[PDB]
């Protein structure tokens, strides 16, 4: 339950961004780096689920 609590903190403080390929090809770095804004390429859909 410590592991589950820290995993829940991980998924709450991460945010699973469902992004297609051809935009952000570098895996989002598993969404582990700081840049500030998502951005794709030319489209404007962006599907980050909380």
């Amino acid at each position: 339950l410590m592991r589950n609590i820290m995993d829940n903190i991980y998924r709450t403080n991460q945010g699973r961004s469902v992004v297609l390929d051809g935009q952000v090809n570098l895996e989002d770095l598993l969404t582990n780096e700081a840049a500030g804004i998502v951005r794709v390429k030319s489209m404007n859909s962006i599907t980050p689920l909380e």
Partner: protein
Amino acid sequence: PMDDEQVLRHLDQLVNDALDFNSSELSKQRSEALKYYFGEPFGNERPGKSGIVSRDVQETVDWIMPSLMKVFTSGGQVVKYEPDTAEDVEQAEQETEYVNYLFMRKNEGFKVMFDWFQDTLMMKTGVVKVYVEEVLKPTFIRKDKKKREIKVLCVKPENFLVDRLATCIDDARFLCHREKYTVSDLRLLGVPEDVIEEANREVWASECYTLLDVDGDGISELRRILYVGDYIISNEPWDCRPFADLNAYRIAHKFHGMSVYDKIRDIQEIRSVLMRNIMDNIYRTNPQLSGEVYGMLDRLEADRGKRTGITDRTRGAAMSVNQLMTAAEQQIDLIARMFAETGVKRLFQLLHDHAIKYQNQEEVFQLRGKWVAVNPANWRERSDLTVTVGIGNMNKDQQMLHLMRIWEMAQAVVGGGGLGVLVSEQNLYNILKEVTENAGYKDPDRFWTNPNSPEALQAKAIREQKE
């Protein structure tokens, strides 16, 4: 080896080469930076049409100034020493207060610091020079004789020639600092003649710090040369270069880093051209187009967000701890870190300039008492923990968190357990004092001290025992 005259021509050649390289490259880049900052047309505007240019770095500077002011100009806790715990209070906080009460509050306030930030941000190189002057005007009570004071000034970075292969402060083999040093200063020096260059002849002068060996031996320490016009100079063995040469971004190994213009040039270009197209469209329409360009305009602010101003909004449980996670993960923190360590060296330099001989003055650090500041220990170490990526927890976050938790714990203990067994009035002194720094009234407004005092024995040890 026995160098007395070839040093003059060697320094002249170095100065000329540095003039060429630094002048051309850096001056053209900073001219582009300033014309971007002021928003005049780039020169690609065809005649007969508006050349409206929107300034995108001005708001970036206006947004970063308050954060820098808050992180630096907030108390004297910017730099600490934390020496060995057993004996630390003898000069550590004393020398810290000395430096932050001399530089700040006695060296033109933060004007030097503000211009240093401006130089490292737009002028691309934030570097200042520290040297000495003689204090005068005794009563001849108030006999202020042989007093001298060490101050700092901007190096007019338009005139800060240096070898481009330094990549660090303590690596430059040739430092050139160019100034006016008018005819009055020449008369003070004692030169009888003049140079190629009315009493005010706008004469020009330079000072060179470069390691040399003119004594017929191995390479000696630095040499300070008052190379003015290939004339009488002031040559002297120089130990430490008084400069800081900021790069503002922890750039790769080079003397100077990038700038706000370097990272926002594309944003300013695209914003200006798309504004120009929008007003051209409006002028010609008076098929139609859509306002969705304005929509992209939105992320153009986020474009300034994408580099520095990541808080698109005004300020993007336990009610958003740590000032909402450092003002929405503002990376100015880490930038401040490098800023801080650069200033660290700066402080050490001025510390040396005061650790050799300054004066017999004493500190007004909340209380009387300070020994002569002419022989402090350098300690060969500083710190910037309470500002930035180190401890760096600012005022109000610690305020709410610490105050609430330790206060509820202390009142619960007082009600149930008591005072002396745990944290007591001796350490409730610290509990209240941290609140005092949270509000800024440390010593004078509230003594609150009562560790072991003559009032303590009669109040806490005599009547409180027999109550």
